[PDB]
Design a protein around this ligand. Structure first.
Ligand code: HEM
Ligand SMILES: [Cl-]
Ligand SMILES: [Cl-]
Ligand SMILES: [Cl-]
Length: 416
């Protein structure tokens, strides 16, 4: 998410008025040196189900993280944040107030419903051979030495899969990846006009590409998600503005997260090569391994973000209207109430509880099932075909709040 220039302030005034906030641990997650793995983070979770931060209440335990991701009294956060920050009237404000993640209730159900079908079990099964073949072809052409796993694998896979999903030429995967990244939604709640022009231009370039695809599909429809949403448009169900906004939401949400999560898998296995070898010996372990990567290194350590729509109380805490509530999946994933030996990466444990890397409630990740398919096909093939990864240079991390994202991940597969 974009940091908003709360800087503590609105959370501060509320904190000064709420006795039920008096015993809540404080975590300053916006500090450049903060780590989700610091001892004080675990201590905070042991102390309390919820913490205060400068921007939001932060839910630290698994049960409550799922409860509040689903609670209808917690609506999408983006529209209130835009009002607070004072985002000028324009394309950036438009997208932040109207993209699927910002919508609630009937409009949300309507628009989301137009995009759910490619992610049903039968349509995941339908795309699995493409995913498998794409992964195989990427492994085939990997460099033999030290190389950036992002450029050579974690970028192309989800870029190609998004092109295939949305009916873009596969040869546009590089362009599509760039266009997605440069939407820079992580900066969209900035107060700086120069930063917001950069977001405005990124969004504009994306829509340059998307609206051409949409206009093609209006006359030359195919068997793809763009075309399917276009049919809903021809049927009067949504308008042109909604059409492009919905396609853009899906593209942006589906690309960088998946890219990052693939890179994080490799980083985990570089630390634990013995577990890579277990997958190689028994590649049926890949789904369980993927779930352990999602548990231990979720790419969105903050998953569900919400704001209170009314004053209410949950597990002893009064949450006043307008208070942002963020679900800390990273920390919940180490909740000893749910996970055995939670502070160890171990793909060999068959766990009753899944990761909650995809949020929850009506907004839960639209692409959950496709994300897992991509991660599983990748981990199975990489572990079958290659020696364990080891890091080969500086890993460059995205600075965005709530994101664990290697921009570049130099590695080698095997010491030789
Ligand atoms: C490992 C990869 C991914 C992770 C960890 C992830 C995680 C998330 C999370 C945490 C949310 C918020 C859920 C909530 O508010 O409760 C979300 C929303 C969303 N994601 Fe994903 N995502 C990933 C990949 C994808 C993919 C592959 C797609 C589509 C192809 C996608 C499309 C979306 C969309 C469209 C939303 C908004 C849903 C709505 O507001 O109704 N994401 N994702
Ligand atoms: Cl605990
Ligand atoms: Cl307690
Ligand atoms: Cl467990």
């Amino acid at each position: 998410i974009s940091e908003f220039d709360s800087e503590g302030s609105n959370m501060s005034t509320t904190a000064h008025t709420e006795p039920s906030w008096a015993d809540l641990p404080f975590l300053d997650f916006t500090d450049p040196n903060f780590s989700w793995d610091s001892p004080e983070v675990a201590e905070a979770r042991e102390k309390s189900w919820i913490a205060r931060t400068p921007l939001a209440l932060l839910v630290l335990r698994y049960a409550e993280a799922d409860q509040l991701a689903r609670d209808k009294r917690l609506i999408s956060g983006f529209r209130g944040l835009v009002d607070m920050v004072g985002t000028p009237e324009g394309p950036v404000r438009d997208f932040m107030v109207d993209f699927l993640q910002s919508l609630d209730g009937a409009d949300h159900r309507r628009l989301r419903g137009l995009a759910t079908h490619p992610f049903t079990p039968r349509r995941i099964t339908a795309v699995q051979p493409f995913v498998r073949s794409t992964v195989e072809q990427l492994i085939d052409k990997l460099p033999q030495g030290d190389f950036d796993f992002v450029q050579h694998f974690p970028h192309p896979l989800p870029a190609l899969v998004m092109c295939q999903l949305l009916g873009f030429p596969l040869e546009d995967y590089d362009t599509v990846g760039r266009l997605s990244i440069e939407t820079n939604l992580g900066l969209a709640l900035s107060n700086d006009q120069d930063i917001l022009v950069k977001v405005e231009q990124g969004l504009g370039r994306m829509f340059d590409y998307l609206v051409a695809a949409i206009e093609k599909r209006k006359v030359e429809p195919g068997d793809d998600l763009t075309s399917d949403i276009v049919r809903a448009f021809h049927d009067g169900v949504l308008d042109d503005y909604e059409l492009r906004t919905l396609v853009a939401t899906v593209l942006v949400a589906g690309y960088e997260t998946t890219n990052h999560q693939l890179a994080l898998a490799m980083y985990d296995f570089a630390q634990h090569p013995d577990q890579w070898m277990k997958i190689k010996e028994n590649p049926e372990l890949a789904p369980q391994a993927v779930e352990e990567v999602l548990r231990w290194s979720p790419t969105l350590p903050v998953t569900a973000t919400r704001v209170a729509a009314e004053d209410f109380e949950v597990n002893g805490v009064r949450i006043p209207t307008g208070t942002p509530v963020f679900m800390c999946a990273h920390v919940a994933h180490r909740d000893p109430r749910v996970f055995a030996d939670a502070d160890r990466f171990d793909i060999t444990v068959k766990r009753e509880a899944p990761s909650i890397a995809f949020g929850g409630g009506p907004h839960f990740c639209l692409g959950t099932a496709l994300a897992r398919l991509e991660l599983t096909e990748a981990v199975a093939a990489l572990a079958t075909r290659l020696d364990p990864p080891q890091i080969a240079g500086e890993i460059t991390w995205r600075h965005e709040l709530g994101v664990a994202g290697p921009d570049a991940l130099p590695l080698r597969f095997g010491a030789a």
